[PDB]
Ligand SMILES: NC(=O)c1ccc[n+]([C@@H]2O[C@H](COP(=O)([O-])OP(=O)(O)OC[C@H]3O[C@@H](n4cnc5c(N)ncnc54)[C@H](OP(=O)(O)O)[C@@H]3O)[C@@H](O)[C@H]2O)c1
Ligand SMILES: NC(=O)c1ccc[n+]([C@@H]2O[C@H](COP(=O)([O-])OP(=O)(O)OC[C@H]3O[C@@H](n4cnc5c(N)ncnc54)[C@H](OP(=O)(O)O)[C@@H]3O)[C@@H](O)[C@H]2O)c1
């Protein structure tokens with residue numbers, strides 16, 4: 200259930216926001232847009248130094264306030280405590296942007312069970328832990344959770360098997376709890392972001408000299424994420440391909456969820 | 472992946488070497504039985520030792536070429552790995568790996584139980600990956616098949632089954648991706664993903680007792696349909712008691728989209 204109007208930057212002014220994986224790439228881009236909009240930001244990642252750079256530019260850009268707390272989202276204790284500390288720094292929370300992933304490479308799957316588990320722990324499970332911890336704050340602000348996923352969390356590509364497992368898991372979990380928030384009247388929005396290849400240094404280094412589809416700009420990607428999030432959209436799509444509309448516009452899933460969503464809808468085609 | 476264009480006939484399994492997990496009860500047990508009637512060699516597994524022994528007996532009675540059981544929990548990755556080697560030895564190889572077991576769950580709103588989420592991912596998903604890695608060399612030898620049992624709720628969202636849907640979405644992501652890897656690497660092992668609606672197994676029927684519109688499909692037919700899809704090397708089996716649902720759950724447009732992505736570079740240019 201989105202917000203009616205069109206996006207205005209004014210919407211984030213004074214809002215209290217967490218961005219994870221925000222020392223590099225898209226997370227850093229998002230932090231910068233949030234700063235320019237005059238939000239309070241807490242950013243996180245493992246690296247002390249790179250987070251400081253981002254904090255400094257955020258303040259320069261006009262952020263109501265800016266802070267960083269460092270640590271690995273492999274540590275579910277850290278994840279849980281991080282949201283607590285970040286909520287103290289800002290006096291509440293309006294938007295939780297879940298963006299970090301564990302380092303991965305483009306490669307055939309062979310037998311790296313430990314990579315599959317780590318991808319699942321860092322890319323999926325840590326997001327559930329951060330959500331549980333943030334939810335009381337979000338409940339009292341009528342806030343928003345933004346979950347960064349990928350085209351590879353909607354369709355199958357080779358070379359990203361463990362990664363794709365974890366992005367699909369995000370769709371299943373968060374789309375399910377969105378249905379639960381709706382039956383339990385929890386006014387917290389959940390936005391799933393489905394991104395094409397984006398020109399972050401990590402990705403551009405991986406695809407160097409291999410044949411692949413155009414990368415889209417990270418800066419606009421980051422604004423489009425914040426906009427869909429602020430507007431409380433269920434999904435945000437950002438990529439460069441003409442083909443992607445085949446995914447975006449397929450209404451089958453929405454039709455099925457609708458058919459099964461009430462006893463009255465199931466009564467159309469199913470005996471009581 | 473190429474489906475065999477021959478019609479299904481019971482003889483396709485006679486003397487074939489087949490694993491079935493989750494076979495002490497429900498669909499799994501039904502599958503073991505069907506495979507017995509076809510004269511396959513079966514190794515069955517689950518945690519319930521005395522129920523499995525019973526299952527092995529009725530199997531032999533129905534005409535299984537050989538029938539053994541090894542008991543253990545798929546919470547334990549070591550055991551998953553162990554189970555496959557030992558089951559191979561018992562049969563002289565492996566033609567089909569049928570992955571069917573899930574960890575217990577109930578129909579409830581998710582609150583804060585990260586541990587049940589993790590355990591779901593470990594058992595319903597990570598174990599399936601361990602079993603596959605352990606099975607692959609033998610399935611290469613035989614040009615065999617991997618069958619992965621999943622659910623409507625691994626394709627669309629439902630409330631009350633969040634951790635469970637995460638694990639089932641994860642299976643789609645992982646196995647659909649390694650299927651693309653197997654086509655480009657020319658590995659001749661098929662991957663069939665089965666998408667089931669509500670089935671009339673005792674676990675499910677208990678959990679939905681007294682709930683309205685709970686139309687279940689018969690587990691006996693369900694089990695046959697999975698075996699056929701596996702045997703015919705189909706990419707997906709769709710099985711539900713509603714005709715509408717069975718039609719609407721097809722997603723050929725994702726498969727076309729996947730092809731387009733695999734044959735595009737730069738601004739949607741064709742590689743060939
Ligand atoms: N770039 C693409 O082509 C693309 C496409 C589709 C979707 N996405 C999605 O967009 C999001 C951001 O991607 P990106 O390419 O911008 O990534 P990135 O630039 O490589 O940055 C990843 C961020 O996560 C942090 N990180 C890595 N491991 C961590 C850990 N264990 N604990 C805490 N933080 C950790 C990194 O900082 P530290 O190393 O210091 O911890 C960094 O801040 C991801 O969710 C990704 O799936 C990207
Ligand atoms: N029933 C439905 O309405 C429905 C719908 C869609 C999809 N499915 C799928 O169909 C498959 C089977 O479902 P079902 O209804 O037949 O299930 P079930 O009757 O409840 O039995 C599940 C099987 O998994 C085994 N199992 C449980 N925990 C285990 C563990 N830790 N390690 C190893 N095995 C374990 C159980 O045996 P033990 O207790 O002896 O270990 C049992 O044999 C599942 O993958 C499920 O997701 C079912």
Ligand SMILES: C[C@](O)(c1ccc(C(=O)N(C2CC2)[C@H]2CC[C@](CCC(N)=O)(c3ccccc3)CC2)cc1)C(F)(F)F
Nearest residue numbers: 303304305349350351358394395396401402405411412732
């Ligand atoms: C972590 C990482 O930065 C990463 C970046 C993005 C993604 C991802 O989400 N995408 C999905 C959104 C499209 C991948 C898909 C595979 C890809 C596109 C293939 C094509 N058809 O265009 C490809 C695979 C193999 C070779 C070359 C390209 C590259 C992009 C995953 C990991 C890495 F790993 F370091 F790069």
Ligand SMILES: C[C@](O)(c1ccc(C(=O)N(C2CC2)[C@H]2CC[C@](CCC(N)=O)(c3ccccc3)CC2)cc1)C(F)(F)F
Nearest residue numbers: 459576577578622623624629631667668669674675678679
């Ligand atoms: C383990 C278990 O036996 C189980 C059985 C099946 C499934 C499953 O895969 N299905 C998907 C295939 C359809 C569920 C989805 C939710 C469901 C359908 C909702 C509706 N509108 O039809 C429902 C939710 C809430 C209340 C009542 C029903 C029941 C069926 C998951 C777990 C349990 F948990 F013990 F039951």
